[PDB]
Amino acid sequence: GLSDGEWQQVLNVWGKVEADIAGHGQEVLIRLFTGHPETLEKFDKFKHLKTEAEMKASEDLKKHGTVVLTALGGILKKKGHHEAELKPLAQSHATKHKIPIKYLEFISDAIIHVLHSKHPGDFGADAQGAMTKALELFRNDIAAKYKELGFQ
Ligand code: HEM
């Protein structure tokens, strides 16, 4: 449950991401994969990436980063009214990709890390609070769908 002012902060922060969705998406995934190498194993199409240099050079990783952040941005712009947008992602990530909710926590924190890394001094405490709450809401609603599906 975010206030109007918190959603305003979220969407203000998101404008930073939308200016360079592929660069943000790439860095989010690289942060996820390098911080939590087990997550790489969930991607048949990225498990060949042995080094961060290879990850950085991967155009397909940037492409997927764009897909991920485009989806997330579409969800965030719903300001919590995202059941229709979230449902297929929860279902695909539980049933097809088999992504534990822990990895969604990892990527949520990776987003925060990337925002500070790319916008140092420009991702204020209020913005971090609002973005964190929005990612918690996202993760929590996914978690509810995971529970429905019995997925761990
Ligand atoms: C912000 C959180 C995430 C968003 C918005 C997101 C979004 C997406 C989207 C839109 C797709 C393609 C459509 C689909 O298959 O449903 C996808 C595919 C996929 N996602 Fe995610 N995802 C997120 C987090 C994760 C995490 C944390 C993992 C694993 C650690 C993961 C693993 C995968 C895999 C393996 C695929 C299939 C990739 C392929 O083979 O093309 N996702 N994701």
Residue pointed to by tokens 């994969």: 33
Neighbours of 71 (CB within 10 A): 14
CATH code of the domain in which 24 resides: 1.10.490.10
Distance CA 7, CA 63 (A): 27
Query: What is the Cα–Cα distance from 2 to 140, expressed in whole angstroms?
Result: 13
Question: What kind of experiment solved this structure?
Answer: X-ray
Resolution (A): 1.4
> What's the rounded Cα separation, in Å, for the pair 111 and 71?
14
Total domains in the chain come to 1
| Domain boundaries, position 63 | 1-152
Q: Is 22 in the pocket of ligand 1 (CB under 6 A)?
A: no
d(Cα 100, Cα 92) in Å, to the nearest integer? 12
64 annotated as a binding-site residue: yes
Residue 12 CA, ligand 1 centroid: distance in Å = 24
Q: Which residue has the tokens 């911080």?
A: 35
Give the number of the atom of ligand 1 that is nearest the alpha carbon of residue 108.
1
Cα(95)–Cα(136) distance, integer angstroms: 21
Q: Catalogue the long-range contacts made by 76-82 (C-beta closer than 8 Å, 24 or more residues apart).
A: 76/10, 76/11, 76/14, 76/134, 76/138, 77/11, 77/14, 79/2, 79/7, 79/11, 80/1, 80/2, 80/7, 80/137, 82/138, 82/141
